[PDB]
């Protein structure tokens, strides 16, 4: 088996729903980090790229019909380069990284690109075909996030809880208080505001140019103005006996990210800078109704196989779909609610979460943080709608 | 060291015609059919040990939305502890599921996996972009059954947005594939498929969908050369691709088990073939049908296997023009006996996400019947790709 | 300075098709044109460039009936481009409102020769989708226009409710004490009388056929499709109410959802003479009434009382009453309020909408033409046609055979 | 033996401001918008016994959106009128609101009614999209169509025989066939803007208007479409709608707009009973048809029909309110009727190029504004006339009391 190295990595800013990136087609948005990789890495012979693997949760809109291939062509990569799109909802972009890793480790490829995209602003409506002539039963459904075309058998067996309902279920089952959720959310906002001011995100970001030209360069989901008092006043999404609010949850967002992965031979050939070795990826399943706890079996599976303890990681990038689930996962894994190595630059409550891009962001930001801190091993892990988790481990070199 | 990977049991639904026998069956329910059959057929498996379900699906806007692999495993009655992920390389999605499952086991990250694919083209929805302004007068519905929607002007200007049949006409023109040769190939597909269906070959691959649907519906066994000759080309009288020398739009699902040697033992599986490798290739979108050529060359060069060494070649028949052009470029006769011996998608149809899984499982099936050793499955991909996967009977 | 007498002359209609049935393939504008084409063929003395106006009723106007179907239909029918058209909407009463509006135009001296009619293709009624009220709105929705509420105003719901038409008919059954048994008996008489009229060739005298293309050749639709002549009291008794076990309105004691068109000529005495028409009845007058939306089926009562008080005609003086049968509960309630027996011989002698169906815009025109037809066959003198209207109205129109 | 026709009087009249597409009134449902002038008539006329209103006649060209299912009746209920009052909706496209007035007149004249309300509404901002039903299971042929203005669900037989020219295409056809120059069209457009600006500044429109309340609440008080600073240079620079060889521009055409209007009509006996002020007698209405492809010339046969029957010359009118769908057709109509392009009695306060034209509301506006102008000027007879899509015209004559 072959060592696999993450090399350059870059992302767009993350836009708010209907905000700074809402006019940018998903395929064009995916192409932005690909074009930046080309510009940033002039020693690469681009016709040698073996594959572009991209995560995308939707695929009904301008991201239809294999957005990985659409994006590589729009980015100016040669038509000889193949592309494939992966869908594990919020974990899609991490699955692109781990799939790229397995292709190189198994000797099938040498040089690849992995990343992800989502334009939740531009997610379309969908309408099933008529099932009879002159049918009176036509319906439009929003694909921005969550259930559509509900199967009655899925509802009867597993339920079709909304994402916030699942987060309330985790809060109840794992006993995560509203006060702790809000404290976690505030720390995310404070840490993200500090990282933004320090120029940490700027080092990850390439601008999006929109045709005078408008240039989008800053993550705009952040709410640095957040106070505990303001969080406390919010009403829960699902009623007064519940805990999840708009303030202790991520949002729906737009963005894309990409990075290069390479064998040792490809690193040398293409003049790349190897930044981390990929150690491995593991997935896990849980009940849909408590999907937020999905990371726990994934992390345990990966760490047990690699012979690494959770405490051995110098950074943990844990997706913040909801504070209730971030906290429940940390507690289950034996990590403090405010452990210093967890989400040190904040996370999705502040930054937002374009589903397909989010997992690629967690890997690239974990690597970035290992470089800043001089850490060795990093873990990125996230929950998945309909009850999964994904975990991926890297080691700085 | 890398780990050997074995394909074990494999099963599929029949392939239904658009609006036909399977049109009432939701894509998620359809995907669950072969998964439930793998449970029934493999009594020694401890199902909570399955590491992953990988499924191909080209659409994902309809009842196949939000990661159909995971939806399908839950509907099939598999434990909720089992993860799933959905792959999209258009017509090659199901083959990509197989090769992706292979790489996961080969690299030591998994031991027992299911790979498959689904498409319900009958039930593909319409899509409507959001309004870009309040009171927008510019709202539009687009069909997602097959082909371009939400066309990007930059894609059109640089690469074109040729329909799939237009790309097949382009291949016929550029590679000099005559109408007569296309029709001869189509007739052989129908003849061979009708023979295989009479011999019970497809029946050995099929689990019924419950009215019991048990037979592939797309076959036209009555096809004659005279009948094909009369047909008018899709794109006008100067062109060559017709409805008779092209595949169709179809519904179906397929799945198979892959396992390490240790998992084969533990779960009482029957190892049937070793997976040798997978490769992908890119070509100009406008001649997408030629995509298999760089994929096959890449795979064979890496493995050190000549194309002539394969005892079966399962080449997707999206169009006779591209099937023929691919064979000619690879130095294989238009009617070579090892190519599509039981016919192909012209006769059988091609639900996009399921097709590539069908090619792998039917190649293996054919090796078993014939006593052959190495098999190659390969197919073209819209927007200009190819994928190839090689196996070896145990 | 005096008003002018107004005569109804020739009148014709398509058959009435079932939803999704015999006429479902026919665009609403083309369907409206069918009776217009028949009037042209049937009345060859008319100088067609003299027609002052075509008035057509249509309740929907969102589909192929959009943008003034009266004018679309007259052009499709081959009438001169010089002929104006206008479309009226009083829901189920639209076609009757077309007749009365044509009458008022001639009575007031403003016109001499007109066509009045109505159309509905409920099979082909489209879906509607409001515009986005913001960029990237997540709140887009489709709504069926086949029948009943869409784009509900919360202020309408809060003040008057948005009861479905069958719910209003249950409200009438409750408030006016009309039993399930009586509703089903009325429905059975409608079916029996319509089956008898069909067998007698009565409907055939009113109908122009519609030609339809099939794969192997053409067919003609010549018979009303909605009738259920094998209806029995037992069959009706077994049906479940639309709105739950404590209710009374069923699919069997209500009209349906249907397709059809009708049209007729109205003319001054001078126009009858000039154009070689055959005058058949004089129009006496039209009146409208309003009631609570939640009991819309009782709407005919104020309309009939208003018209008859003004004309000085008792309800009992009419030799035919054509009362729309939207629901048996409301047909019965109206008769009871007006002092007419539930089975009075002069009411709906050839059956009504429970048997025949009710394409909204066409229905009111049908009631007028069939009342006149029945007067001619029976030797009767005065006729009354009246019908209820969604959102709480009634309309009534009286005629007298020449 | 018939009795005597009854004289019919227009009494109070009122309108909303006219909003731009997606502009000041875009948030207001058509049914609620229609109710605004009805509520104002109630407030303005306390002598009326409202349960005596025989009918509310309203024009509306669309009827697919919040104006569905007989907007006249919807609006009268929303306005607080008793549930005993009937309502009916008329559709002659851009002439609907005028057809409501004339239909109300005929109902009173023929003795069938005594006290009625006539008006019209359009919310073109909020006009919905429409989608035909599937004709077959798993149909691949589903389509959305905009109902804001103009053709949808095109019939191939209509297209083949008469064409399906857009309204601006018809206006180009009129420019071509009637020889109306781009320069003349632009000059007409400029005079519309100048006259409307002067009228607005003089408080003339304010006398006709009731404000609309908007959720935020704020009020909308003034017509939004006017471009008072319009120059000929700017008009000259505009590109034609239909391509470089044509003449119709956005600057010499009406717009797409939102608004509602209503007025009271009454017999002499009702005027007395309800303490109304009779303001004009209605003399008559006539309609006419022309080729769809040149629909803008529709007013010519309607005006000729009406004036011939009444025995009034076009030159006898003290005001002519001619709808300005397009300058090309406004000019072509005047020329055919022998009236100068800039005749002082024509549109003295400007027209739809400046003010806009919510289809169902526009014809009611023309009638009420013609009456207003007769009062201001001391004139006697007024003519209101308009063109209609798919080839019609409508004309209505009044006489100040
Ligand atoms: C009342 C209404 C809801 C019924 O709709 P529906 O259920 O689709 O009507 P159907 O004709 O399919 O009848 C329903 C069932 O009752 C049965 N039924 C109806 N009339 C029957 C009869 N006379 N004898 C026996 N069975 C009868 C039908 O056969 C059917 O049974 P099925 O489903 O097994 O075939 C619908 O017709 C409606 O909305 N009508 C009101 C229209 C209106 O408001 N305006 C028109 C009057 S102006
Ligand atoms: C003619 C029509 C197609 C134009 O629609 P539109 O293009 O959306 O109109 P706009 O208001 O945007 O005007 C278009 C442009 O011309 C400019 N323009 C219009 N009038 C102008 C003037 N007087 N001075 C300067 N510029 C002017 C606008 O500012 C605008 O510039 P921009 O769009 O680049 O910013 C449309 O108004 C229409 O269909 N009207 C016909 C109505 C009809 O058939 N019936 C109603 C009357 S009965
Ligand atoms: C129903 C499948 C939608 C995917 C698009 C089809 C075109 C692929 O080549
Ligand atoms: C097809 C008709 C649409 C009009 C709405 C019908 C409801 C009337 O009571
Ligand atoms: C909003 C109005 C819809 C009616 C169509 C307008 C076209 C008339 O010429
Ligand atoms: Cl989701
Ligand atoms: Cl995240
Ligand atoms: Cl295939
Ligand atoms: Cl009826
Ligand atoms: Cl106007
Ligand atoms: K994976
Ligand atoms: K519906
Ligand atoms: K098998």
Author numbering:
A (entry chain C): 1 to 211, 215 to 400
B (entry chain B): 0 to 209, 217 to 400
C (entry chain D): -1 to 400
D (entry chain A): -3 to 212, 216 to 400
List sentences quoted exactly from the publication behind this structure.
Degradative or 3-ketoacyl-CoA thiolases are involved in the thiolytic breakdown of β-ketoacyl-CoA to acetyl-CoA and shorter acyl CoA molecule and can accommodate long acyl chain substrates. In this study, a degradative thiolase, β-ketoadipyl-CoA thiolase (PcaF) from the β-ketoadipate pathway is explored. The pcaF gene is located in the gene cluster pcaRKF and encodes the last enzyme of the β-ketoadipate pathway involved in the conversion of β-ketoadipyl-CoA into succinyl-CoA and acetyl-CoA (TCA cycle intermediates). The overall structural assembly of PcaF monomer comprises of an α/β topology β1α1β2α2β3α3β4β5 together forming a characteristic five layered thiolase superfamily arrangement,.
The A-mutant and AS-mutant when soaked with 3 mM Hex-CoA and Oct-CoA, respectively, led to two complexes. The AS-mutant-Oct-CoA complex comprises of cleaved Oct-CoA in which the CoA remains free and the cleaved octanoyl derivative in the form of octanal (OAL). In the case of the AS-mutation, the disulfide bond was not detected as a serine is present instead of cysteine. In AS-mutant-Oct-CoA structure, OAL was bound in the tunnel of all monomers except in the C-monomer where both CoA and acyl group were missing, and that position was occupied by a glycerol molecule. Interestingly, both the HAL and OAL moieties interact with the T143- G146 and R148 tunnel residues which are part of the covering loop. The calculated surface area of the tunnel is 235 Å2 and the surface areas of the HAL and OAL are 124 Å2 and 152 Å2, respectively. An extra 83 Å2 surface area is still available after the tunnel is occupied by the OAL acyl chain which implies that PcaF can bind to the substrates longer than C8 acyl CoA.
